[PDB]
């Protein structure tokens, strides 16, 4: 799609291994790529390779970002967790990977994390410090929008 956040979200590398052999390597002098080779692929191409096959072309090995250690650590203290370090995209990204693999379990998890950030982001919606530095890019953009509504409504409040 046209927005920069999505097309940038597709740019991220995933550890997906090939189910099959594919001569005509476009990545170098294989020429074919031996079966079960683990090659990092951006999301854009890797997205429909898991569908089209009745065995798919790729295994979809779970990304290091989604490692159960992480999905566990985000259940402790999200508010102090640094998202911007790990990817940095999370919600723009994770939203695709939850549909792609059709995982229910973590929905209830991320659906919680994003409330817990936001009950914090209505707190920096009032007129940073260090914290603004650790938000995910898209989340950050929402912070601009909120902070601007508030600032403007305050500047209207007086003269």
């Amino acid at each position: 799609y046209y927005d920069i956040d999505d097309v940038l979200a597709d740019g991220t590398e995933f550890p997906c291994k090939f189910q099959y052999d594919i001569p005509g390597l476009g990545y170098n002098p294989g020429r074919p790529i031996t079966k079960n080779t683990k090659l990092s692929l951006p999301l854009w191409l890797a997205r429909i390779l898991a569908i089209v096959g009745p065995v798919p072309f790729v295994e979809l090995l779970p990304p290091d970002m989604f490692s159960t250690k992480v999905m566990n650590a985000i259940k402790t203290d999200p508010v102090a967790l640094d998202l911007h370090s790990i990817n940095s995209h999370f919600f723009s990204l994770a939203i695709k990977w939850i549909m792609l693999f059709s995982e229910k379990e973590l929905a209830n998890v991320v659906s919680e994390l994003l409330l817990q950030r936001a009950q914090e982001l209505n707190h920096h919606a009032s007129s940073t410090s260090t914290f603004l530095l650790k938000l995910e890019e898209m989340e950050k953009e929402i912070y601009k929008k909120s902070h601007e509504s508030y600032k403007d409504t305050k500047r209207w409040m007086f003269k």
């Binding site: 707190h123 920096h124 009032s126 007129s127 410090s129 409040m157 007086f158």
Partner: protein, 254 residues
């Protein structure tokens, strides 16, 4: 202590009713401070003296007996703002920075002791943090009296009464609330007034939210009270330090 009620009522009435046309600068200073979890307040003395001359008349008289009644006075206000009922909320630190008249380092000699003194010097080195106490529980070695001591500022011995004696009181560290402290040590600026002699350095204790606020080597202008501590090294010879409330670095400095 109906007088402390009388003073604190005036401080509440100073925070809630203060108007710079038309926003309430302090009252919003408060909210916007508790939300970021700053737990501090910065009073501008000019507004203060504008509001009542009186409370500044007493605040420049005996600061160290008053200023904590101002702290409790403001935290009793954040109780009615930041939360509502019918925790825990530390008593906020106030940082007051104001113009007045700069009093150079060389010119501090007695006579203004326990009277707020604005001044200017380059910080030498910052001392490593250490905690003082704010609220600590205490039990007796024998009768096991459970006493919650609210220690305030600004040393203070423990009470001996519930043999028993002489001082049978233990500090419970599992429930004790602690704050932080710094110890800046500042050398007055090289431009004035060294003359032919090495410039003196007064030892300063920052605390709570002013701590680690300043990188050593940066020019600053401190405000704070001026006061003396013992520190055996006679007779009697007590040595000088400047408590800081509150610090403001020079432009900008970020």
């Amino acid at each position: 202590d109906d007088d402390n009620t009388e003073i604190i009522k005036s401080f509440k009435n100073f925070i809630l009713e203060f108007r710079l046309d038309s926003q309430f600068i302090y009252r919003d200073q408060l909210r916007n401070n508790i939300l970021v979890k700053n737990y501090s307040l910065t009073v501008n003395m000019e507004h203060l003296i504008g509001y009542n001359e009186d409370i500044y008349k007493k605040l420049s008289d005996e600061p160290s007996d008053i200023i904590p009644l101002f702290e409790t006075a403001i935290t009793q206000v954040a109780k009615r703002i930041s939360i509502l009922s019918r925790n825990s909320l530390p008593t906020f630190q106030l940082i007051l920075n104001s113009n007045a008249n700069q009093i150079p380092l060389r010119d501090l000699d007695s006579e203004h002791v326990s009277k707020i003194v604005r001044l200017s010097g380059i910080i030498i080195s910052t001392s490593v943090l250490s905690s003082r106490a704010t609220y600590l529980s205490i039990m007796c070695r024998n009768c096991r009296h459970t006493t919650s001591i609210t220690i305030n500022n600004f040393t203070v011995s423990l009470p001996r009464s519930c043999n028993c004696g002489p001082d049978p009181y233990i500090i419970i560290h599992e429930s004790s609330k602690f704050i932080d402290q710094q110890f800046l040590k500042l050398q007055e600026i090289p431009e004035l007034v060294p003359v032919g002699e090495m410039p003196r350095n007064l030892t300063m204790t920052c605390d709570r939210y002013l701590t680690n606020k300043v990188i050593p080597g940066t020019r600053v202008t401190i405000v704070g009270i001026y006061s003396i501590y013992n520190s055996k090294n006679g007779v009697a010879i007590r040595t000088p330090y400047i408590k800081i409330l509150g610090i403001q670095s020079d432009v900008e400095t970020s």
